[PDB]
Amino acid sequence: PTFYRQELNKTIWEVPERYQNLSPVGSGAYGSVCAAFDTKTGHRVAVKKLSRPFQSIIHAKRTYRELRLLKHMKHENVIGLLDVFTPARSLEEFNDVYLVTHLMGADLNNIVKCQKLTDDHVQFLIYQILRGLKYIHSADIIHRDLKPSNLAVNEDSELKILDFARHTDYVATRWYRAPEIMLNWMHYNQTVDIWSVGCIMAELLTGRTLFPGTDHIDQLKLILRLVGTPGAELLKKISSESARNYIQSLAQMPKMNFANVFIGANPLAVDLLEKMLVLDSDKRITAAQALAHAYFAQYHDPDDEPVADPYDQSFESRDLLIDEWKSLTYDEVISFVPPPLDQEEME
Ligand SMILES: Nc1nccc(-c2c(-c3ccc(F)cc3)ncn2C2CCNCC2)n1
Ligand SMILES: CCCNS(=O)(=O)c1ccc(N2C(=O)C=CC2=O)cc1
Ligand SMILES: [Ca+2]
Ligand SMILES: [Ca+2]
Ligand SMILES: [Ca+2]
């Protein structure tokens, strides 16, 4: 294919002539994104140019990680790949990676900002998050930083999870993070993401951030004001003695009845929130269980809530050289098989 060059976000993009009318639509994890028109199919796409993918051992493994993950994700509520390309003609020239997915116009913050959502609409939005989470969790993939800005949404309220790192190479919101993540507790499970769903859903119902803490201690205090002081057994999860002593020293707070907090909400929504927003992560409802909850009765369809194929993450424990990660990434670019344009059939 013929490539052309265009300066976007102050850097040269080099893309096949198949993709036209590129214009920036913001940054993603380790990359920046442009909307484009795919002249082969007439579809609107988003193209992410990875930022400096092989600049360091951290970037190189992150690049491989992201490409492997996105090549595996095949679910209507999870960002996956229509195409992956590089202007490189060989491994020796290979320094840039572009990922292509269907264009989504907005994020969840654009949905709830200027609209009092109906309960039926909130149901649909949360349902889709949970359906996507069931799929990713079934492949032993945890998001760990689920939040409205990591939920891409189109003009019809269809939603996809994205941006789901080992090493430190921007100030992120922590308001949606599970307590065990935010405070670095020693162990956690897939239900970290269910806490985040609870935080998101609460905000869709009230129009207000549930736990808008100014720092991690203020956020913890806001959380405990809602869910109540936890037992000693939760201290078992916390390595730092200073942290444990502090939590233990706090004045004891009762759990609030969520029906007194979410005034006017559908009682089924309140019940679901009670099942998601619990500190005991082993008692937190799972994504698959939440999909069966009566709150989603009008959307739930067990024939259309699939799980993922097994996902081999053994590479995560390996230290390889930068050129080895680069070569493996090149292999994954070259081996990518685009999906059919139409992959769905009437039920
Ligand atoms: N507009 C739009 N549409 C779809 C996805 C994205 C996208 C991607 C991304 C990921 C993989 C890929 F192959 C192509 C793009 N990464 C971050 N974003 C965000 C850009 C700003 N927030 C909303 C989504 N943006
Ligand atoms: C963070 C809650 C603090 N309490 S609040 O800000 O006053 C409040 C705001 C909105 C609601 N609500 C629902 O729950 C459903 C419809 C609706 O109006 C309830 C409470
Ligand atoms: Ca259906
Ligand atoms: Ca079809
Ligand atoms: Ca069916």
From Swiss-Prot:
Residues 19-296 form the Protein kinase domain. ATP binds at V25, G26, S27, G28, A29, Y30, G31, S32, V33, K48. Its cofactor is Mg(2+). The active site is at D163. GO terms for biological process: angiogenesis; apoptotic process; bone development; cartilage condensation; cell morphogenesis; cell surface receptor protein serine/threonine kinase signaling pathway; cellular response to ionizing radiation; cellular response to lipopolysaccharide. The keyword S-adenosyl-L-methionine does not apply. The keyword Phosphoprotein applies. Keywords: Acetylation, Apoptosis, ATP-binding, Cytoplasm, Kinase, Nucleotide-binding, Nucleus, Phosphoprotein, Serine/threonine-protein kinase, Stress response, Transcription, Transcription regulation, Transferase, Ubl conjugation. PROSITE patterns: MAPK, PROTEIN_KINASE_ATP, PROTEIN_KINASE_DOM. Dual phosphorylation can also be mediated by TAB1-mediated autophosphorylation. TCR engagement in T-cells also leads to Tyr-311 phosphorylation by ZAP70. Dephosphorylated and inactivated by DUPS1, DUSP10 and DUSP16. PPM1D also mediates dephosphorylation and inactivation of MAPK14. Acetylated at Lys-48 and Lys-147 by KAT2B and EP300. Acetylation at Lys-48 increases the affinity for ATP and enhances kinase activity. Lys-48 and Lys-147 are deacetylated by HDAC3. It catalyses: L-seryl-[protein] + ATP = O-phospho-L-seryl-[protein] + ADP + H(+); L-threonyl-[protein] + ATP = O-phospho-L-threonyl-[protein] + ADP + H(+). Its EC number is 2.7.11.24. The modification Phosphotyrosine is found at Y170, Y311. It is found in: Cytoplasm; Nucleus. Serine/threonine kinase which acts as an essential component of the MAP kinase signal transduction pathway. MAPK14 is one of the four p38 MAPKs which play an important role in the cascades of cellular responses evoked by extracellular stimuli such as pro-inflammatory cytokines or physical stress leading to direct activation of transcription factors. Accordingly, p38 MAPKs phosphorylate a broad range of proteins and it has been estimated that they may have approximately 200 to 300 substrates each. Belongs to the protein kinase superfamily. CMGC Ser/Thr protein kinase family. MAP kinase subfamily. The TXY motif contains the threonine and tyrosine residues whose phosphorylation activates the MAP kinases. Component of a signaling complex containing at least AKAP13, PKN1, MAPK14, ZAK and MAP2K3. Within this complex, AKAP13 interacts directly with PKN1, which in turn recruits MAPK14, MAP2K3 and ZAK. Binds to a kinase interaction motif within the protein tyrosine phosphatase, PTPRR. This interaction retains MAPK14 in the cytoplasm and prevents nuclear accumulation. Interacts with SPAG9 and GADD45A. Interacts with CDC25B, CDC25C, DUSP1, DUSP10, DUSP16, NP60, SUPT20H and TAB1. Interacts with casein kinase II subunits CSNK2A1 and CSNK2B. Interacts with PPM1D. This is Mitogen-activated protein kinase 14. It comes from Mus musculus (Mouse).
